[PDB]
Amino acid sequence: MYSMPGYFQNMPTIGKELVNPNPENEQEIKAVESDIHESIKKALDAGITSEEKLNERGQLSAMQRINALIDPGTWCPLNSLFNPENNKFGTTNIVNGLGRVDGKWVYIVASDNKKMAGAWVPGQAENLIRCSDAAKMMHLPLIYLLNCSGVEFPNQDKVYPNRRGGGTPFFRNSELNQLGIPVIVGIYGTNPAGGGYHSISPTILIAHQDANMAVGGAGDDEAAEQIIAAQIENSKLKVPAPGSVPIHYDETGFFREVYQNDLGVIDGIKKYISYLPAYNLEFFRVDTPKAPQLPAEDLYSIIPMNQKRPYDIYEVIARLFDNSEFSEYKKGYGPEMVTGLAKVNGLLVGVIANVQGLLMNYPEYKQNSVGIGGKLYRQGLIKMNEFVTLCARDRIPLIWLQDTTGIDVGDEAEKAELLGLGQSLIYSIENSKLPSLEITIRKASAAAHYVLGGPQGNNTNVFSIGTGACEYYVMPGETAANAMYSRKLVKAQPIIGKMNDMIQMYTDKSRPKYCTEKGMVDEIVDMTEVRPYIQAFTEAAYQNPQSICPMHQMLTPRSTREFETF
Amino acid sequence: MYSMPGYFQNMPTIGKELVNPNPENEQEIKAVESDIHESIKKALDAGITSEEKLNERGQLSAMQRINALIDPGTWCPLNSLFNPENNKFGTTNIVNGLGRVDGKWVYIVASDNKKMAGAWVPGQAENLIRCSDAAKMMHLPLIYLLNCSGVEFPNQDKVYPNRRGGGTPFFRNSELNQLGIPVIVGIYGTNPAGGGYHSISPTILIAHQDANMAVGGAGDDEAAEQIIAAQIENSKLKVPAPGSVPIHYDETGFFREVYQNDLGVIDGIKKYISYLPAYNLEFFRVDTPKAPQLPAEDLYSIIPMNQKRPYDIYEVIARLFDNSEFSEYKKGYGPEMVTGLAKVNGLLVGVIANVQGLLMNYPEYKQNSVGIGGKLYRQGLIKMNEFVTLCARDRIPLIWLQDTTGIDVGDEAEKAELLGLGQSLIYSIENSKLPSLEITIRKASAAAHYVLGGPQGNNTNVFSIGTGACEYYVMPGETAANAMYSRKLVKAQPIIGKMNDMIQMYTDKSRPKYCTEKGMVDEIVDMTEVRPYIQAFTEAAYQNPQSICPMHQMLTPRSTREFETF
Amino acid sequence: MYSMPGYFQNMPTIGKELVNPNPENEQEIKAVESDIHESIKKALDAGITSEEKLNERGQLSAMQRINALIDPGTWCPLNSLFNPENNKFGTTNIVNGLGRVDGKWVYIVASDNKKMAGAWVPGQAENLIRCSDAAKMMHLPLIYLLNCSGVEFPNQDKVYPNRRGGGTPFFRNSELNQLGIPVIVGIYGTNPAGGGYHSISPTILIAHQDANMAVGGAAAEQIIAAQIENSKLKVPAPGSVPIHYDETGFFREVYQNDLGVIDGIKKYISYLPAYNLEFFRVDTPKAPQLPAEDLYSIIPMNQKRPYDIYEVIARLFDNSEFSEYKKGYGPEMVTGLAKVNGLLVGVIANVQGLLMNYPEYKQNSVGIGGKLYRQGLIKMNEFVTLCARDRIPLIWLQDTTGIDVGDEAEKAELLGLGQSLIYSIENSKLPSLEITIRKASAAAHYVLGGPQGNNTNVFSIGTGACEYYVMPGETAANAMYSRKQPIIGKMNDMIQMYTDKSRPKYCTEKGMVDEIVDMTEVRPYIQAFTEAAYQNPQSICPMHQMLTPRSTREFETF
């Protein structure tokens, strides 16, 4: 019961059954994966109040609230270890990511009430903007599980002011609303000032019976003593915390609904989520959802931690996409890249990925050359330009699989227009106006990181994820030390020492964990977890898209076919 | 020769001649202004190569290139002291701001070739985004005077990766182009990799004859020696720097034009600027341009450095806007704010500004009260909501003059809807979809900083400026130390000591210079320089606006009139 | 001083010098062209008040006002003979088209004050919407030379009410303003009610000193008493200068005479944003290398004769240069880049004649030029999509008899590929011009950048050799009456009617095509359109970031 099975079903299948496993490699990847999981667990547990203590006082933690909201097994966290300003607890005081609620994907943001009652900490504003941007680009509902005490007083200068500070999300929520994207808030505990605007900015307000939202909270030694007198007098005065339920439900009616406990609040949210517009994804399917035909655990063997080793990218694609099917656009032209159509739970996506290894008699603009997989040449850049443009016309979201060492350099490459072709790709992406996912398989480096659907496209890239085998740098430490200090040897030992410093630093500052802490990549995900994220993304993309191309009116399949025959 | 003189000419005049000058105050302001000018001069001079040395080698500095481009006296720098990451030289290696070129306003970005040949330094990416955002919001041409050596190798992790890093401007330039906003580049010196994409991303490329743009640049002790052999062999090889004029002019034709020297490049830019679409501002005028009727130097007396002193805001408005004329919207309603129409070189703007001092028998929702000027109440918030909405419909840009201590707090204020009214203002602003300017007169604090056209509105606020009398904090240090440590005295000397630490820190981290270094405000401007910036902004706003309301079809003047009569 | 001469300069040249002229054909074309010119002249002269009488009373006619405004030789009229409701005078009481004012292209609408003082007549509302749509799609300034007495009382039911009636332009002017497109009005004579809203809706109002704009203007024996009492009362016509200048200030400026009003308009036009077209040029403007008058020989009036489309393209575009996209693939169509006064346009045009061993989905087949097959439709889909990305406007040259029919064609996806083209055009979001060379027929007329794309096609023009029908009269009579002597008679009626109702003049009267233009006048219209398109475009693609030239090159080499 689908359109055009001749084009969209029984596509060529790709990938081989894994002949030689590699335990050493698998163990190396899993060591990175373990450290990530361990750091996340330690960070989620950190803070002045435990989950156990929270539960005793009648409150749920962020993860408890999240797990009560979502369909089991659908949680795709992002920015778990994001901590650009290096807070001691290791987080930005929010837990965020994608989750599914009774079949509907939503973007979830949860205050960490274990840590200073969910206070604004350095790096949080940035994290929050990455949330609302994702919702914006995907037209996906934004859900706040809110428990926010506002500005951290010692850090006010880092959390209160500026273009992208604590005030920005309030504008971003109005923008979402104006773009037709609903925002739903569960209001827990005390939310004064900063937390008050997080409470009031959403579309729908569901309150805990003890919760509040307010413009402002309650209310030498001779100086020092005076304060404790006023405090204990006000405490015996028993004035209620401003903007409690008797105010914001009974008087202003800004609280739409009030629930007795945390799980009641969740039920309220679930109810309003059920009201939200969403396609039955069947509408956009070209085939019934099918698992890949090769197991994802093979990826622990296929993707080498030895950064000097090539591998076959088709083996990766075969394990990530429905039924191991792939419909390649212009195979043979631009051999440094794979571009083609694939399926994700029956839904069309365009896949763009680096080819690794030696490229015989290539590029064409060089007399007698061998090309390096992971680099970009003329035909690859042109093929991508076309494929992006075609997918954009067809309203087909793009998933980029990056493992790249840059664009070809030198005057032969220059004459081949590579600088202009790279920028043309940037222009093509910006022109596409569709949500896109970027997945760093191993190397994200040079300008290729930018042009290959990089997170530098703030209008199209929703977020980025990386595997345990990934690394981010401008160029390898060795090449960098070279270009920096080679001319300073044309003059001149103190220089040798700081070349080895640079090499060491580039290794340190390019490790997967460091990369996600700085937010270079949003999440480090397990090899068995990459497809889940692709599924989350793709289903979110097609849940309520702002534009449609009927299948019979799509150009990509037609142009792909013609190139194969003509 | 203007529409509706009955509405737009002979408006009420405001302001008094200054009776009592205040030398002490004037001197205090000018001390802040001097320190700013002095820090800017020191920062512009800093770097491994002087202007004198640059000139000897046949090159102009950033400021020389800028001064050769612009009409004399039209330079409005922004982010002069922006240095969020605290680079030693004190800058982000770019000089940026507004400048006029033969009557046309343009946004200007100039590489600082005194410092590591214009290398990407920490904080630069952010600075560059503030540039392209301004051009985007105002539909104003972006001009690059480019001399960029790319990534600073030691700092690569801070300048190369991430959503808002060195790659982002290349996407932002494509966005500008796609929105119909031209980008023009003068290409000087060597521009490899990162600087190559700054070269190629603009609409128009004008090159210095010795300049280049490229995807990549040229080309233990036994290890160490090997490098200097290859280097000196390549140096004697005399291979030209990749992507020089014989390549990018003669072969690729990406350089549109080539000039012999720096001033030739400027002439080329001037020529292409002359091609750009721009209104004769006469088209949008409602009166002939007229100076204010009171001198701006009085502002050194009027605006008190004593943060506890009120002043009359009308005295400020009278000195900033054409002919000291003001057409107030709903005077008497919402007395804590002034909202009304003014003129800037004959062009209509909407002005929103705090009233200072005691407000008798106010707010209305309190039994017997005296209101504090600089705070926001019910009627003020509602009046602003309406005025913003009206100006938005009329396509009249808004200028916000902030001097504020926040929104009224407590359950009487809550019942009066202040939390929802504040957010309604945010929604109203976001809905306006027009470029806006924010000017901090003194206090930018609390949520009022956000709602009063704050820079937290990334779609509407083009940039923000502040006077020498300005200060930024969440709340005063004393109130902050209180709310932080008062409950920790209900338990318990080590606490007293860190309360005085907080008070001191809030004073340090809220000084005008510190605020602009962090980018809380984009520029600290002289009292005599505020009108110039307002003129730059307003004329840029009306140069090529994307939407028009004919004067006879404007609602703001009509509604303003009806309230006065009915 | 241009980007990428390697791509944009010294493109292949096309066309041959004309070997054998054809006087018979030329004369046949010029006979149609003469009849058009003659009908236009008669229509412009028609009406109860002559130009001579207007001049005596101190007033200029529509054409005098237009000719005083525009740079000489830049007038591109549209809808000259548009008269869908068949008014006796032959017009819709407005003169409209493209004109250039001191180098700036603008859209011009002028009230015909020769005819019932510029009253609203049947068909006018539709004509006015075609004006504001053009301005909308090109972001081009709209100029009204206004002299409008409002609703024609006898015809009120046809000019006053409905979604697309006399009130619609007032909403369309607000839309233009909100899209940032300025509207400038010169207010002449009396403009009450309907004409009052034409006066007030624009951005800028310039008034003649005797002019007015108003909400409303100023048994049997009883009426003439009140009338003569009011006439002796000497009450001024409502909303005159002492009101709308002195009191309301809705008139921005007042001039003593018609030419003063024009000067005021010129001044405000000079204020308007416009590129120096040099900014978007890839070469200096160059005439074609073959004369346009050859087209009188090249394009056959004998509708059964093929001709070489390249000969047409060679005579319309700068320096006879053409950079063809995917030559050899989809031979029934020509798609490629060309230049118009140095500016890039994408050209899509039918190939005529026999196509050997084609289409590929059939066995031993000969293809018919002017028809659309699989590869043509796919090539156009790609080329449209590529030009859209590159912000390159499209010019469509139509001479077509439809899309291939039958189950082999169906299996080849032709129905879906045709609609994909429609989708592709709608997706392009750029102003486009459509020129009917000869045949506009079947679904091909729709998909080949037809005027049915109300968001992209600015207007359409046709040559004297053009004709519009669903299908030929013979084929139509067949399909209608084959399944059915009284029947033979009404088959010949149908054939005759299809010939009658498909003549160039009839087509433009009904608005099927907006203007019938002379063979020597096609390039001028292309120049007007292209220069208007690039005057103030809403989106740019830098030359070095364009995909079309790159993809075109790769197909040639790879």
Ligand SMILES: CC(C)(COP(=O)(O)OP(=O)(O)OC[C@H]1O[C@@H](n2cnc3c(N)ncnc32)[C@H](O)[C@@H]1OP(=O)(O)O)[C@@H](O)C(=O)NCCC(=O)NCCSC(=O)CCCC(=O)O
């Ligand atoms: C640019 C020139 C030719 C200029 O040399 P010059 O004429 O001597 O000029 P000068 O005023 O004496 O300044 C040179 C001096 O300024 C400093 N400097 C220059 N560039 C950098 C940098 N990128 N990072 C850190 N420091 C830099 C160094 O101390 C230079 O000394 P040196 O030239 O080494 O003797 C040269 O210094 C050079 O080649 N520099 C940088 C090497 C390079 O190729 N860098 C590209 C950086 S990687 C990148 O941006 C990648 C982005 C993503 C991608 O596309 O891959």
Ligand SMILES: CC(C)(COP(=O)(O)OP(=O)(O)OC[C@H]1O[C@@H](n2cnc3c(N)ncnc32)[C@H](O)[C@@H]1OP(=O)(O)O)[C@@H](O)C(=O)NCCC(=O)NCCSC(=O)CCCC(=O)O
């Ligand atoms: C929120 C509550 C009621 C929660 O108290 P609780 O029930 O004891 O909860 P708990 O788990 O024991 O946590 C309290 C403890 O967590 C820490 N903490 C809490 N909030 C902050 C903060 N904002 N900055 C820095 N540290 C904070 C403190 O150590 C708290 O201890 P304390 O309550 O003082 O004994 C209370 O701690 C409180 O009132 N906190 C903050 C005071 C306040 O009113 N803050 C508003 C911050 S200003 C702002 O955000 C302005 C934005 C712009 C504007 O609108 O003006």
Ligand SMILES: CC(C)(COP(=O)(O)OP(=O)(O)OC[C@H]1O[C@@H](n2cnc3c(N)ncnc32)[C@H](O)[C@@H]1OP(=O)(O)O)[C@@H](O)C(=O)NCCC(=O)NCCSC(=O)CCCC(=O)O
């Ligand atoms: C406009 C002038 C002042 C023209 O001055 P003039 O020197 O007489 O000019 P002329 O060359 O001699 O032309 C007059 C002659 O042209 C014809 N004519 C003029 N206006 C109309 C019309 N509206 N419908 C049908 N026929 C009209 C009539 O035969 C006129 O003869 P008449 O003036 O009756 O002796 C005058 O004819 C006049 O006052 N006409 C009546 C105009 C009028 O009442 N217009 C309102 C039309 S209703 C409407 O548009 C409402 C729309 C909805 C709304 O906004 O309410």
